[PDB]
């Protein structure tokens, strides 16, 4: 006899009262198995009695972890108390169908009045629950908020994440998309720089004749206003821009004096100064990224950061794809990633590969191993200078 | 699709009441045909594959309204022979297949409960309430309605039982906890009106377990204090008020709710020469709370809401009224 049965699923667990139980001798009959298949026949066996959804993702996390370990949870006990008629199994019992034999044992412990059958052994309740799972979503639909699917994805991801402690030693996506940003916006600064260089030297080409450093070019065309409004060391600007008193500002003044470029319009200068503000904000952003990503590189992989240098070594991280890919790749694959140059490249390939597996499979890494490896490379440079 | 045949069952069982109504002068033949027709179409609509709780409610309203019309008309005809039993029973069966098809509707459930309660079937009502609670164990509203019905009947032990199972379950919201405190203090008031409960330590105890509840907030304790402050005409009301005050002062000391309860604390059972004296005392509390280092915007919003209730009550003096108006305008 089975009277109720459990069903512990990702949206929640639910108990069924059974009416017109299975043909247990005839569990091996084909028409019985297709009758297990069809909803119009299996619902003439199962009817729904009580349902319990999870309240929060952490609550379901507690649920799956206790269940996987075997131990029941307190609110499962609440539910079973809440539905099962009270007794102790002296003159009558109530029979339950459950998956885990361990769970069955603990439920029999918590209640004497019930007899819990594990699906591992009692083949008819095994087939019964199997029918339950096979008509799963069509049984909860009248009160299933959403469907099983997205919630299922969430439960699985949460489980294996907490089990393997993933995020506390995963940061490589942060690193690599940092590197990608650096490369792209560096290219962007360069193209914006040459554009504003051309487009303002159209008005005043003596500036591009006199100054390099297109970033400083952007700063000075910001500060410049017009070619008409000139003075050397006006306020707070040229002193920390460049040499102020006797090297650059007077030269800029005489350049604007002898200048012959076209007289610029107001809306045009507004446009080009908008551009210059843009690109200098972007350059400040680049230096922010430089400082930050160097710090994160110390935070995750210090050893490679000190033996090759953070930007280029990070490039190697990304061009591998991951730290895990990086460590699994052998050193010749890292080479793919005279004769003295070939030998030293092979040597540093060995050393960056071993330092890679070090800094990766370290849980919270160190620094001294990369330090002494850098010293090995330096004394190898000395050994190759010996000759 | 067997829908015609299932309808054949239900309509054929409907038949002999209609036979009797034909045989009485209560309705004529064309009306009878109208009735049968409408019933058949509704029953087919119910046993359609894709059906919905609104359709169910539609049908049961139709039948119940028929019952009322039949009653009124046989009253006008001064006929006492007809009963309502068969109509009520078929009405029940509608509710039963409704909950089998859609168990997951609080709306249809409460319609069922209200139907049973208006026709006088309390044993059945408890059974229905049982199944509904089993299907939706997070619903404070059903928990409340069950327990409040039990308390109104007087079965305090089963009221407590429903409420404790519900507070064992619904631990996200404080709502059931406030409701259980409400009805428990209402039971204490019932005992006092009839004049352990001599102590009446139970709202203190539920406050103690509230302290470790998941929703355990300062605003939670504030609404707790509010429903406690309701019906202060008690014995240990000052005891429990002192207790809730000192607990939230010990736990959330400088919370603006703690300052709010520090203001509104001595106003337990007051309406009246004791009225303005305690008013001035709580006003001293108010000025102290305003000058104290608290989130003055939060505290002032609390105070102007409480003042909104204060000005909502009538029968006060104008000088007091205007100085409240000024102290509100100064916020």
């Amino acid at each position: 006899v089975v009277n109720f049965l459990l069903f512990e699923s990702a949206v929640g667990f639910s108990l069924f009262e059974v009416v017109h139980q299975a043909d247990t001798v005839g569990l091996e009959l084909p028409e019985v198995k297709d009758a297990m298949k069809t909803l119009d026949k299996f619902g003439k066996m199962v009817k729904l009695r009580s349902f319990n959804p999870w309240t929060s993702a952490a609550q379901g996390l507690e649920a799956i972890n206790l269940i996987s370990e075997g131990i029941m949870p307190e609110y499962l006990k609440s539910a079973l108390e809440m539905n099962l008629p009270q007794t102790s199994g002296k003159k009558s019992k109530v029979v339950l169908g459950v998956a885990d034999k361990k769970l069955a044992g603990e439920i029999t412990a918590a209640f004497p009045g019930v007899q819990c059958e594990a699906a591992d052994t009692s083949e008819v309740v095994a087939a019964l629950l199997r029918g339950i799972r096979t008509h799963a979503n069509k049984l909860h639909k009248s009160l299933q908020e959403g469907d099983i699917g997205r919630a299922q994805l969430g439960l699985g991801h949460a489980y294996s994440r907490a089990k393997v402690k993933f995020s506390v030693h995963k940061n490589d996506n942060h690193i690599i998309q940092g590197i990608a940003t650096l490369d792209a916006l560096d290219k962007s600064i360069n193209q914006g720089a040459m554009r504003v260089r051309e487009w303002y030297g159209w008005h005043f080409p003596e500036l591009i004749r006199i100054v390099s450093d297109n970033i400083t070019y952007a700063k000075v065309v910001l500060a410049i206003g017009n070619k008409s409004s000139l003075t050397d060391e006006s306020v707070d600007d040229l002193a920390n821009v460049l040499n102020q008193d006797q090297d650059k500002a007077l030269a800029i003044i005489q350049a604007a004096k002898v200048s012959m470029g076209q007289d610029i319009s107001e809306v045009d200068l507004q446009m080009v100064r908008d551009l210059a503000s843009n690109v200098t904000s972007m350059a400040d952003y680049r230096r922010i990224l430089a400082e930050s990503l160097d710090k994160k590189m110390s935070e995750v992989a210090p050893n490679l950061q000190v033996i090759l240098g953070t930007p280029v070594a990070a490039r190697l991280i990304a061009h591998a794809g991951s730290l895990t890919n990086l460590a699994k790749y052998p050193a010749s694959t890292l080479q793919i990633l005279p004769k003295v140059k070939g030998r030293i490249s092979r040597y540093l390939a060995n050393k960056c590969s071993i330092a890679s597996r070090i800094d990766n499979f370290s849980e919270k890494p160190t620094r001294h191993f990369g330090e002494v490896l850098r010293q090995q490379l330096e004394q190898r440079l000395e050994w190759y200078a010996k000759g | 699709a067997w829908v015609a045949d299932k309808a054949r069952f239900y309509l054929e069982r409907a038949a002999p009441e209609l036979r009797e109504w034909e045989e009485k002068e209560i309705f004529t033949k064309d009306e009878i045909r109208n009735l049968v027709a409408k019933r058949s179409d509704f029953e087919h609509l119910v046993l359609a594959p894709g059906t919905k709780p609104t359709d169910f409610l539609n049908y049961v309203n139709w039948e119940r309204s028929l019952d009322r019309l039949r009653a009124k008309r046989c009253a006008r005809l001064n006929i006492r022979s007809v009963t309502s039993h068969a109509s009520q029973a078929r009405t029940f069966g509608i509710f039963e297949r409704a909950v089998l098809k859609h168990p997951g509707s609080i709306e249809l459930w409460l319609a069922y409960l209200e139907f049973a309660a208006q026709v006088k079937a309390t044993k059945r009502w408890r059974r229905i309430m049982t199944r509904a609670l089993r299907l939706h164990p997070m619903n404070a509203s059903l928990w409340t309605l069950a327990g409040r019905r039990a308390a109104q009947n007087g079965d305090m032990q089963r009221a407590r039982a429903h409420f404790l199972r519900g507070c064992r379950f619904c631990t996200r919201e404080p709502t059931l906890w406030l409701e259980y405190a409400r009805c428990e203090m209402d039971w204490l008031a019932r005992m006092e009106a009839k004049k352990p409960a001599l102590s009446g330590a139970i709202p203190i105890a539920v406050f103690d377990v509230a302290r470790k509840q998941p929703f355990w907030g300062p605003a939670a304790a504030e609404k707790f204090f509010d429903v406690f402050a309701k019906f202060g005409h008690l014995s240990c009301h000052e005891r429990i008020i002192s207790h809730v005050v000192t607990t939230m002062q010990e736990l959330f000391p400088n919370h603006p709710c703690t300052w709010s309860v520090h203001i509104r604390q001595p106003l337990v059972g007051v309406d009246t020469p004791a009225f303005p004296k305690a008013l001035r005392e709580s006003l001293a509390r108010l000025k102290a709370a305003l000058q104290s280092t608290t989130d003055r915007k939060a505290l002032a919003t609390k105070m102007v809401a409480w003042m909104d209730g204060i000005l909502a009550i009538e029968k006060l003096d104008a000088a007091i009224r205007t100085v409240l108006e000024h102290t509100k305008r100064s916020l």
């Binding site: 307190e74 | 059974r127 089963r158 407590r160 404790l164 064992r168 352990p196 409960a197 377990v209």
Partner: peptide, 28 residues
Amino acid sequence: DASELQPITQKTSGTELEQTILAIMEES
């Protein structure tokens, strides 16, 4: 008869709240 929910005994008291209020009802 699982028709009804039974008034809770100490044997049927699951949570600390129930134990507290049952202690109160016992000393009552």
